[model samples]
Target chain A: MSSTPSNQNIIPIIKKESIVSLFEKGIRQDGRKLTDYRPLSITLDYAKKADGSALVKLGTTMVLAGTKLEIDKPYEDTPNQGNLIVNVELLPDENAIELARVVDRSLRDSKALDLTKLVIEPGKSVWTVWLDVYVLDYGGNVLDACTLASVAALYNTKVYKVEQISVNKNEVVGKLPLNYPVVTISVAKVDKYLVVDPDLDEESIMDAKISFSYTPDLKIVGIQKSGKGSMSLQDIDQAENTARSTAVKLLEELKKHLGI
Target chain B: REMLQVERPKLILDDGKRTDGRKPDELRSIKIELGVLKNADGSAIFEMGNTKAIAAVYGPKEMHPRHLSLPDRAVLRVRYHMTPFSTDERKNPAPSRREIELSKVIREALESAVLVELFPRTAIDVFTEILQADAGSRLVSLMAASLALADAGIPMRDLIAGVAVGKADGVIILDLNETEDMWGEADMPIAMMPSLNQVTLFQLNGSMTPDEFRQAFDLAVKGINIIYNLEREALKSKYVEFKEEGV
Candidate 1:
């Protein structure tokens, strides 16, 4: 909320420059190559009391995740299955709700959260896992951080067996945890190249970008494209390719951390 | 004062160790995660002891009336609120002067940290909600908001730290929890940048001699170093992988 002399002087210089044209020259203003994403690190089960948790950071973008398990009515259409809910917040301190929104929208629009996979029982017994994502810091490329944290959190979740369920009157009875696994990945379009991970400078100047989600089995679940821009078929293909490769690496990393 | 008796469980002892058993210099085990809420643009939740606050920041978009917009910069709106029962005492129904002061103080601190001119004709909002109020509500909320702001990836000059230093039983304590403020005679909270020794906000409450003030300020700076590391650790880690991306 407070203004400083340095920022007061420098931002105009940044706005006048074109993000797209700058990256087109094979260098970001930060001197990063087009494909270079910010560095990353993650802490699994970082929250002590949450059902599940993970803290993921992409350079300046930091996100904390916790999975809250709840029991809810199974849709008559999908009686035997479970559900997954993910919530992302842009904290007042974080000052970047747009990043959280894009990450949340990507999970939803991309159908990356396929409920069919979470069903522990056919009709009555199911587990609804709500993943909450909070942005701790806005580093540069939050898409990747959000995606990585969400998937890692789901992987870290330990659902109980939905032992039994008895529906009576207006009330319902359901048991503890169930077992399932899933993951998400993100890619950005910048300088005609589909980048696997985007840094702040690249994202600020990109044509368009998408956060793509895939199950561990390589199933495409969802894709959320953002920015006041569009991507060509080739760009989509390139992004998908990047997502696939990045996802595999992420899965391995998750396995190492979660040991699942 | 009777309410203080029930609430102020002994956090420290004459032996110089906290009731939790840590030395004065130790910080409550800090746990931070950025982007915890889907509804927020930039959000984070920080847990320091049992003190929990959720910080949210919005905008850098067009200002509503145009006049409110700074011709050369963006305007910032900051709000700090607590859940009704966040503390032992129930708050009054209306916004109190304390709340207003908090909002103004945090707003000014944030304004100092943010790069306002980056988004001309726009406004940015910072809101802090304390789910649980321990002590040092303002500092905790402000520190949490600073982290959340960085997590949201907004343009800023630097991550800021809020530290509360005060005299308790005549001894100056760093980073007071709830008990210190009531029993303590003097309190000062300063928002500072560790790297540059740049101070964005400084406030003093209670009585202090000039020497006492200088001593308190000096002690608080020491505490800022610790706070700074935690903030930087949260921020720099995001780019950890990229530091070596080229090689």
Candidate 2:
């Protein structure tokens, strides 16, 4: 949350200059190709005590997503549909505020979870699924990592049935009715080079960063753009291409982990 | 009615093992990673069983709001926070009184090790975040902060290691997890400087006889030593990578 750019603390001025120059040579300071992404690993149900939880690591950037279910009144407009609340806590560093909002849109706009299935007696009582994400490590591209963790947490969730209002109610557990899997790919435009999943150094030097959430059926559910820099129509198209292919590979890997 | 009818399970098994199948005086499986974050001066993720904590060290930088600056030494501040989803039950995101008290003691545990006198008119901020909790989060946070300071290359007297020893089922248990902590009698968390053999932090909850306290203290030292080695290895692994890279 400091006024000074965080990258300035890690990457020296000389190295920052070198980062931009390296992009011109079709390379990155970390010896990565322009579109290279760091190693990604996800641990599902990491927090066994919680209803659902996931630990997502995108290179050094690590995020934990945990979903807790509660019974509450439904929103007026969507009385029959349950709620999906997503919150991100990157305190002492609120720069990731937008990161959380984008993931929320990606989940809701894509209708990733079947909300109507969560309704209990309609407006009287419904399940409210709270997805809380904690940024454990900030390497870079937190949006992508958070989105992956959120998706995994939701998939791992087990929703319990509420029978009667009494104490002896049955504790029937069932999997969440998921509509489709949504994956987000964040591409950073450093000068003219568009890199998928930019690390902290690359993010600091990048001009504009855009994220796209896509489904396996080639449906674009969400999009967000940030940074002081602007992008050209050509850059936008290239970024989408980069995002689409990356999303395909990432979604496949996620499915393999879920045994789907 | 259900609460009245429910009976608490035995905290210890008949075979003298705890609920998680660990014997008394047995430590949890610990994993630690140093330099996990790029934005901070030093960072670490420490996991002790189901409890996971991350620490980030930022400073000795200029202290914000000039009035907080010290004349002859750097100010050491520690913020220990637990996320809402860290526990099985949902907790509010705001910092509670428990968090503030824990922050105070954690700062005390770290202040003794850091050479804050060298950096005048500055501050060193240590952020300890608990992403998952199964008890003993404060001990893990303190241990993680010490590792982060060393990772930051900050001058320190010695790296601190900590562990919680509690009495469950009339026996002293080392590194109590959530179940043991919830139902056990007498939970004692201790932080120690291995090199100096000095105890910087100790807190006791529930009740224990004097003899049990002595047993718990002795067991905690043994447990802390194991954690100390783990911390040393984590730091060494980072440096080993740097050495290979010709840093």
Candidate 3:
């Protein structure tokens, strides 16, 4: 979804307001530097009503994610690989239209999440992993917040298996078959500066932000970018540099919270 | 009618040892791995006495409109799937009535142990696949589900354990093997919350008098206590599996 051109007119006003911060040699109200991200806290099952749930906060921005697994006929092309689906919803409760699309686009474009990697039986019995991201509180950075919530929830989950169809005598013997691991990370663009994790204000006055998914080994898996703005080759490189470093920290937090 | 049973590989030999030369109450064997599936929210694969079950937990999100859901609490959807080759004779492709009922009972047991209200108006789906079938398939499925939920780090009241007790020639045996089940007159499979010493799933098939039932229930409970310890230890070992990851 593209924003109306008139929305761009407000950029100069936001830029002018931001200039005072530059003049005073300071950052936004959140006190984060141009490249620094807002403080965040991630908690598992923050939703009293979710199966595998997590909530992430960036300054005042909050995003909640839940994973749902369902069974279906494996897709024709990849029956062995399980499917992972993502849907982002911005409720009227949050009251931000652009915020919804931005978060939605990032997840849709995330390179960190490889849908192909989920194949379990290649084309026959792929387990479908569905992700739901909701913004309960709107601050400045829904995309970054949602990405953290997504990965944290994934890292915190576990699955189980059984060997026999019946408890009769003839059956016995086998091993557990486990699958892979995936995580998502997002980036925000503010003026010429690219930030790994952004607060609410940084998101409002930014040119464009890119969100990507990554494997545990730091391999790029998916990508998404948005806003009424432009980013150059150098800007893309800078944003990625920010993402890889932040991903390491987030991964640490994920492991710590899960006690894994 | 005389029930059929396999006597070639005797579970209890004249030497006073089990067919596999194990003690009377000894479990066949067990192995547990947590967080094994990539696509599902929470997944675990468990192997017990040659019986393997993969339990995948998904959700704490919005319920589908078509599927009826409980409004006051979260709805748990469970499916027990089996491959035709998982059994002695090839099973039909469609789910059997017995398997469907077993899945419902497993879901009921988990409902008691899980804090489902934490995700009101949402649905939690659990799918258990029986890749192999032995005498205690139901018990194995329940155990697999419990471990999968715990490994996913879902909060619970206590670890649950499942085991079956059966009567053969009027004698009650705790934890029946596959062959013993055919020779038995009755089967009572149970799921329990060890911390609270409570029964979450209690099921029976065939017939048993009041006294026979009481004796079998007591023995099965005892078996659960033994199993509870093993379940805890198996889960501990699962935690240690990734210690080599050095995270």
Candidate 4:
């Protein structure tokens, strides 16, 4: 939505063209290359009230992910598997629906959580993991920030033992059997240059964008391409190459924050 | 619930210090930031110890719902909300009675300072969100909202400063912490126009003797003066770059 221009808005029009002109030189206004991302910081257990939580900062963009657990009957189609529901509250705009969907698809496609392990009973009961992401501030590359928060929260989560009939839980704890964590890397096509982690200003002038989610093993589990602008095969090739290297660096950073 | 709570022997130590080791006239560590939100006209984040809050100010612009508009002065609207995850226990999302009352008082505290007559038949909206709750959340929210107003470059007579003083352990404390606020014998929240030395908002939750009330009133004025200085500094910090550039 930031890239799309409407007549009612005149300010972004001036910004949009000026930003694209800057991209012609393979540089950005923030003095970063096409492949550079803003500074990233992650705070685990940031929400003391929730079962698990993480606060992510991608430049000035801030998002908080809170994980809450509830017990419920499994879906008839997937009787033994638990559920992962992701809900997002976009502070400034409702256009974040796509942001939520992309994060949800990334985790679901990668099978990051061992859902089968959450079942307390074969068909009757299971743990429903709820990830509620709150957008505290919007700077840019929110999808990447939200995905990182989701992954950090899942890693921080610990399931407590619950009594058979009572709704209360005991002190016993179990770790989630998470596979190699998946990370989403966003590559924005500004003019002819492919930029990674576009800030709010850069995103407004983007022509095309691709978000790829991958594990540490370099296996791509999810791909989302958005924007009205078209990309050539060579552009896709370049975006994927940049995304792969960036994802690897980010995965290592995530491990360091988790002290793994 | 009473049995489940761990009982403590005493809130005041032999040294006459409160549980968090503060004297009668001590306040929590306070931090304030201005123009933090890019989308809003003006915004600020205020922190007092573990409590955190963010306030955003939008418009003295055209008022929607036509009848709400004032002919001679702009209308002031305030909403003070606490996120569900702000507390140790999950709080419901709906607006509680306490929140409604706080909204009213917060607007009253700010309305007097704003030069609403400058923009008539319009509205100025302020939203204060508490992200964490330790204690004295309402006062912190008001303090941040006033800074946000100043950040918006809105005309004002004087910035409003707020602080809460309470009687705990048989002594009046300048700033009440979470535990003191909960179990203290009496608590009073006050907001003032520091330049005029005038009280704009005042509320008390418990009873106090005439002497105790007078001591708290004077102590609160003293504490608010310090907070008022910090509020001014927060606003000036936003222009530190301009000063450094010799603009």
CA-lDDT, candidates in order? 0.66, 0.83, 0.64, 0.82
C-alpha lDDT of residue B156 in model 1: 82
- Model 1 error, position B216 (Å): 19
CAPRI-style quality class for the chain A–B interface of candidate 2? acceptable
List model 2 lDDT by residue over A55-149, tens digit each: 89888788888898888888889899998888897743345667778898888888888889888878788888898888877788888989889
For candidate 1, the docking band is: incorrect
Stretches of candidate 2 off by over 4 Å are: A1-17, A91-94, A161-172, B1-25, B36-39, B167-174, B208-215, B229-247
Q: Arrange candidates, best DockQ first.
A: 2, 4, 1, 3
Q: What C-alpha lDDT, on a 0 to 100 scale, does residue A76 get in candidate 3?
A: 78
Candidates 2 and 4, the one with greater TM-score: 2
Over all chains combined, what TM-score does candidate 2 have?
Answer: 0.84
The number of the candidate with the highest TM-score is: 2
**DockQ per candidate:** 0.11, 0.38, 0.02, 0.28
Model 3 chain A: ten consecutive residues of lowest lDDT: A169-178
How do the residues A97-179 of candidate 4 rate in per-residue lDDT, one tens digit apiece? 78878899889888888788788887999888888787877787888999999899888876777786444544637767688
Poorest stretch of ten by lDDT in candidate 3 chain B:
B238-247
lDDT by residue for model 1 (B53-153), tens: 77877757787677777888888888787654355443432478999988898888888888888888888888787756777778778887888788778
Task: Return the lDDT, model 2, position A108.
Answer: 85
